[PDB]
Write a protein that binds this ligand. Structure first.
Ligand SMILES: [Mn+2]
Length: 92
């Protein structure tokens, strides 16, 4: 195909993923395993409630790792925002 169409299909697939039964289940499994604590904060010796589960390697970078628990981290907002900025340096 053309690059634009493949990008469109990739993005539509990623959008749908977050509505999926498998994501809903896996998100809960990760939060539960993490006791709803931000994992980056914990590494920095801080206790902060997690509000989101983020892909370490972004979903749009490696579709194959979309449901891998070792590719998922519970994060607080500050750490999610920090990671989002960092990932822009990596990927755009
Ligand atoms: Mn944090």
């Amino acid at each position: 195909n053309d690059k634009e169409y493949d990008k469109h299909k990739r993005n539509q697939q990623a959008r749908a993923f977050y509505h999926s039964r498998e994501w809903e289940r896996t998100r809960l499994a990760v939060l539960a395993k993490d006791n709803y604590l931000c994992q980056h904060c914990l590494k920095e010796k801080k206790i902060t409630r997690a509000v989101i589960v983020d892909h370490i390697t972004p979903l749009l970078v490696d579709w194959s790792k979309r449901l891998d628990m070792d590719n998922l981290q519970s994060l607080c907002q500050a750490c999610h925002n920090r990671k989002t900025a960092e990932d822009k340096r990596r990927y755009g």
